[model samples]
Target: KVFERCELARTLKRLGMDGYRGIALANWMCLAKWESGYNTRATNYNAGDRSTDYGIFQINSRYWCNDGKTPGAVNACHLSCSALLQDNIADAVACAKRVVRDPQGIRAWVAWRNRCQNRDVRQYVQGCGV
Candidate 1:
């Protein structure tokens, strides 16, 4: 499902993401825009490594989600990769918090590192009144 920018901002705030340093709501919005276009069902598979990224946050099966096929998956979030594809993002948010706690922090998302880093993404939430 595709979400309006404002709706996504509101949800992120409600999920307490607004207070997460380095991953403020605006940065999260920007990351989501590039990673999955705010589509809950987004999924991408990398054939070379046989790994997959799932959902709005594109959590990787190699480390976060268990697809039951990814060898040596840590399953840090202890969830099925399929669970991230649903419109209900409670699980996604919970798992993302885990990712942020890692050493890389929000930079774990390459989109954030390449697109959102060292940039003010407040425009992403400009009109949302978030």
Candidate 2:
């Protein structure tokens, strides 16, 4: 399921992503926009690490979820990678929350670092009334 901009912003807020771990809502929205474009089923396999990034936040199989294929992966979120692809998004939301608990915080995602960080991310949540 691909979500519209405001829809995803509201959804992220509803899931408690707003200001999670000191990260602003716009940054999260920016991350989602660049990571997966708010598509719930998006997946990308990393040939370098043999791990896959799943769902809107692009949570990785090697570090966040167990996909049974990523070598030496630790299931920090304690859920299967397939759950990240669900349209409901609750599972992915939970995992995303867990991710920021780490020391790196939102910097865990290179997309955010490369594209969203230190930029005017207000545009991401613009007109969303969030």
Candidate 3:
């Protein structure tokens, strides 16, 4: 699913992403925009670590999910990596919540820090009645 910007915003808000752990919904929006361009089935393989990032938040296999192929990896999200590719996005959201439970917060996503950290990211959630 390639989500429209405000559509994704409303979805995130409905999923309780708004102000979760002091990370605004717009921030999540920005992260998704940069990381996956709002595409639910997005995937990226990190050759350096032999791990893959999956779904909208691009949650990683090395530490977030298990694909049974990543060597010596952690399943911190405790689910199959394929779960993150579903269009429903519930599992992805749940795993995203888990990723931020630590001190990293939203900074768990390098794309967020580089593209959204201090930028005017409110445009991601502007209007559309979010």
Candidate 4:
């Protein structure tokens, strides 16, 4: 499912991400925009590591979710990687929260590091009224 930026902002706000310091809704939305263009079914395979990143946040199979084919996946979120491909993003959001709690915080996402980090992202949610 592809979501409008405002829809994403509202959803993130409803998920309690509005004022979560580094996990602000605008930056999170910017990360999603760069990571998946708001596509729920997005996936990226990294040949260098033979790992796949899944869903809107692109949670990695190497540590976050079980790709089934990846040997010894940590599965920290205890969820199938395919689960993140669904239009319903409840599980994705839950897993992302876990990722954010890690030491890297939102920087766990390379897109956030390259784009959203240390940037004023208020424009990403400018008219959402979230």
Candidate 5:
């Protein structure tokens, strides 16, 4: 959980994440708490390879992994690829930051937040950076 949240924060920071720190942290915390409960090793049996489709942000391992250009590492680690595939936090964080900055990515993040709320998430998500 710490790993994912820390990495996500780093990513958001690089993107000049729009929301205030409290709001961003709240949003991130909400996402992390509900998704995999912040477990970096979380996985879903319904997904192939018990994929990256799980976790706090429900990030897709296939895409996130390749974003770092470490396909082999992703294949090897399966859903846990983010921990090992990324040479450093900066590398993975940079990739995530770039993705969330894109128009589509931002839109997706908004949708993701909505999904979390729909799940009746009690966690705060003020600002949401949406």
Candidate 6:
């Protein structure tokens, strides 16, 4: 876990994005811990099993990826689909920034947890990689 939760937190602060965004960063970090455990290369083998999401955010492929299969199949960025497939952290983080900047505020972020919380968590539960 080179980029563990603590590391990510520290990185967020170091990146000078914590003052106004610490709370969201904290929430995102917590979700990251639950999603991929800070593993950048993490992947789900169960395909669309609902669980087994991948990447640092553990976003399900169908919902987050672009390939249309597996847990991380959907393209990530609205700007460039291919850039997301390359696992561009900048793009990923930018996407997250945009998400946090949504007009409704962090509600979108909260919605992610709320929407899937009651769902079969079994299919979505997974650990991160190193």
lDDT of each: 0.90, 0.92, 0.92, 0.87, 0.46, 0.49
The sequence of per-residue lDDT tens digits that candidate 5 reaches over residues 1-130 is 3454445555555555435332344454555456556555465433444334534355555555432433343432233444523324434334445446545643345545565544544334333342
> How far is 55's C-alpha from truth in model 2 (Å)?
0.5
lDDT, candidate 2, residue 117? Answer: 79
Residue 107, candidate 5: Cα error in Å is 4.5
Screening candidate 4 with a backbone cut-off below 3 angstroms (N, C-alpha, C), the clashing residue pairs are none
Lowest lDDT block of 10, candidate 4 = 16-25
TM-score of each: 0.96, 0.97, 0.97, 0.94, 0.45, 0.51
Which lDDT tens digits does candidate 4 get at residues 22-122?
66678888989999999999999988888999999888999999988776679999999989999988899989888888898888887788988888888
Q: Which pairs in model 1 have colliding backbones?
A: none
Rank order (by lDDT, best first): 3, 2, 1, 4, 6, 5
- Highest lDDT scorer: 3
Worst 10 residues of 1 by lDDT: 18-27
CA deviation > 4 Å runs, candidate 1: none
Per-residue accuracy of model 2 over 7-105 as CA lDDT, tens digit each: 888988988888888989999888889999889899999999899999988999998999999999999999999999999999998998999999999
Model 3 spans with C-alpha error above 4 angstroms: none
Model 3 has how many clashing residue pairs?
0
TM value for model 6: 0.51
Clashing pairs in 3: none
Tens digit of per-residue lDDT, candidate 6, span 28-129? 555565656666666655533653344565444454445444444444445333333334355556555654564644454453476544344322222322
RMSD of each: 1.0, 0.7, 0.7, 1.2, 7.4, 8.3
